[PDB]
Design a protein around this ligand. Structure first.
Ligand code: A1AXI
Length: 212
């Protein structure tokens, strides 16, 4: 695999979003991976609906949190609508998929990266954007403005994001806190430290969609 990956340069990443106060990071994280795999497989970059996952993933808990895996399983077992058809409201409502016509995209499965394994995560990122989790509660992460982030941070993961690239010393993360946070919405998190958890627990739980 190459020394640098940046899915933005391949036209596989949509603009940075802001989840607001709702605990919907799990849905935002999943959607980034769907937008990516559909571009990689079909050549078209579209925005898909975080709100639909928020409303319809019965294994998750709406704005009280949820699971990227379950959201990705939903897209594989049913599908997902375009964001324009099912726009983001920042609050959980009833599932409205059947009212909104046929699904726009559908995947074929979900896979988990072997946890606590930097190289396995880099391999997956080289193939497509990946849903990852980290500890975002610390003030250092909250206040991040730029550079390769080394912490301080623990490994008590609490926030799902998406890995969209890497380089020799970092993994490139698309966050869902708007374009005014970090590097225009992104953070580069240090890698190669030899801590199996990853910086901020980044290697704890990583999933990606499969599409034939
Ligand atoms: C992430 C965010 O910042 O929006 C969000 O808090 C999240 O989904 N976190 C997530 C998580 O904690 N998932 C489980 C939620 C369980 C709620 C239980 C409610 C019922 C209690 N009786 C994980 C993935 C990131 C860490």
């Amino acid at each position: 695999i190459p020394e640098y990956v940046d899915w933005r340069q391949k036209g596989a990443v949509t603009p940075v979003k802001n989840q607001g106060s709702c605990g919907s990071c799990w849905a935002f994280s999943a959607v980034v991976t769907i937008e990516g795999i559909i571009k990689i497989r079909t050549g078209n970059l579209n925005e898909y609906s975080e709100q639909e996952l928020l409303d319809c993933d019965r294994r998750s808990y709406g704005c009280n949190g949820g699971y990227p895996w379950s959201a990705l399983q939903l897209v594989a077992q049913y599908g997902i609508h375009y964001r324009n058809t099912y726009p983001y409201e920042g609050v959980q409502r009833y599932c409205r998929s059947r009212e909104k016509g046929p699904y726009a995209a559908k995947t074929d499965g979900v896979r988990q990266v072997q946890p606590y394994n930097e190289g396995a995560l880099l391999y997956s990122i080289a193939n497509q954007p990946v849903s990852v989790v980290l500890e975002a509660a610390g003030k250092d992460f909250q206040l991040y403005r730029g550079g390769i982030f080394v912490g301080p941070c623990g490994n008590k993961v609490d926030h799902a994001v998406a890995a969209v690239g890497y380089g020799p010393n970092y993994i490139l993360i698309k966050n869902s806190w708007g374009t005014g946070w970090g590097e225009n919405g992104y953070i580069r998190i240090k890698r190669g430290t030899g801590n199996s958890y990853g910086v901020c627990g980044l290697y704890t739980s990583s999933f990606y969609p499969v599409k034939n």
